[PDB]
């Protein structure tokens with residue numbers, strides 16, 4: 189079964205300044221007072237989040 | 239892990255406790271002797287261990 | 289140099305998880321036929337072959 193909903197208010201999405209969000213834990217390890225340099229799949233700061 | 243990037247604490251997977259791993263406690267051997275003509279006995283110094 | 293040699297080796301891993309359903313395939317009262325065989329796919333578990 190499938191019914192056409194229609195009423196498509198076709199509006200474009202906007203852009204927002206992603207400031208510092210999107211930082212996760214790159215590995216499964218504990219570090220205490222350690223500044224660690226990683227390289228992994230990340231979201232850059234001040235990005236254009238939709 | 240630590241600043242030197244080595245394993246020093248692991249999580250016990252059955253009982254959820256946190257242990258720490260202090261190393262194998264090796265060291266050097268320094269032998270304190272007079273001359274062979276003077277005497278024949280030595281003293282042994284172990285480098286920096288309890 | 290002196291190194292404190294290890295006394296024993298211990299292997300510690302996570303507790304036994306959910307078992308694979310070998311009880312259903314082996315202790316069923318009535319099995320199927322030869323031309324019609326029930327293909328059961330078993331995954332996401334540890335297979336106890338003991």
Ligand SMILES: *[C@@H]1O[C@H](CO)[C@@H](O)[C@H](O)[C@H]1NC(C)=O
Pocket residue numbers: 190191192
């Ligand atoms: C919804 O409308 C479109 C318009 O072309 C049509 O192609 C489609 O079949 C319709 N959906 C259903 C479920 O009939």
Ligand SMILES: *[C@@H]1O[C@H](CO)[C@@H](O)[C@H](O)[C@H]1NC(C)=O
Pocket residue numbers: 203205235236
């Ligand atoms: C991305 O964000 C910046 C900051 O507001 C903005 O100037 C720029 O136009 C945006 N990019 C697009 C394609 O709109």
Ligand SMILES: *[C@@H]1O[C@H](CO)[C@@H](O)[C@H](O)[C@H]1NC(C)=O
Pocket residue numbers: 251252253303
């Ligand atoms: C694993 O089994 C032990 C019993 O030896 C139990 O004390 C422990 O809580 C179990 N682990 C988990 C995560 O339940």
Ligand SMILES: *[C@@H]1O[C@H](CO)[C@@H](O)[C@H](O)[C@H]1NC(C)=O
Pocket residue numbers: 273275276
């Ligand atoms: C031991 O005795 C004296 C004092 O060191 C020295 O002059 C002598 O040559 C030595 N004798 C040996 C090493 O045989």
Ligand SMILES: *[C@@H]1O[C@H](CO)[C@@H](O)[C@H](O)[C@H]1NC(C)=O
Pocket residue numbers: 287288
């Ligand atoms: C070894 O460690 C204990 C623990 O406090 C200490 O009392 C003792 O003095 C230490 N001995 C040496 C030789 O470092």
